[PDB]
């Protein structure tokens, strides 16, 4: 229940990652098992 946690699987579920600045990424050039292990560009966070 609730949003996807940091460096956890994005899981192809309707649920987004926790915090509007956090974003999903796959490390291989092709992939689907991607994780929320990055931030959107120009996020002014602390």
Curated annotation (Swiss-Prot):
Name the organs or tissues of expression.
Answer: Expressed by the venom gland.
Cystine bridges: which residues? 3-18, 10-24, 17-36, 21-43, 26-34
| Primary location group | secreted
Q: Which UniProt keywords apply?
A: Disulfide bond, Ion channel impairing toxin, Knottin, Neurotoxin, Secreted, Toxin, Voltage-gated sodium channel impairing toxin
Q: Where in the cell is it found?
A: Secreted
Listed GO cellular component terms? extracellular region
Q: Which GO terms describe its molecular function?
A: sodium channel regulator activity; toxin activity
Function, in words = Competes for binding at site 3 of the insect voltage-gated sodium channel (Nav). Insecticidal neurotoxin. Causes temporary paralysis to lepidopteran larvae (10.3 nmol/g) or to crickets (doses from 0.93 to 119 ug/g). Is not toxic to mice when injected intracranially (high doses).
The miscellaneous comment for this protein is: Shows very weak inhibition on rat Nav1.4/SCN4A sodium channels (23% at 50 uM of toxin and 35% at 100 uM).
Q: Which family does it belong to?
A: Belongs to the neurotoxin 02 (plectoxin) family. 02 (plectoxin) subfamily.
Query: What is recorded about the protein's domains?
Result: The presence of a 'disulfide through disulfide knot' structurally defines this protein as a knottin.
What protein does this entry describe?
A: Mu-hexatoxin-Mg2a
Source organism per UniProt: Macrothele gigas
């Amino acid at each position: 229940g609730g949003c996807i946690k940091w460096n956890h699987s994005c899981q192809t579920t309707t649920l987004k990652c926790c915090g509007k600045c956090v974003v999903c990424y796959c490390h291989t050039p092709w992939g689907t098992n991607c994780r929320c292990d990055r931030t959107r560009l120009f996020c002014t966070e602390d």
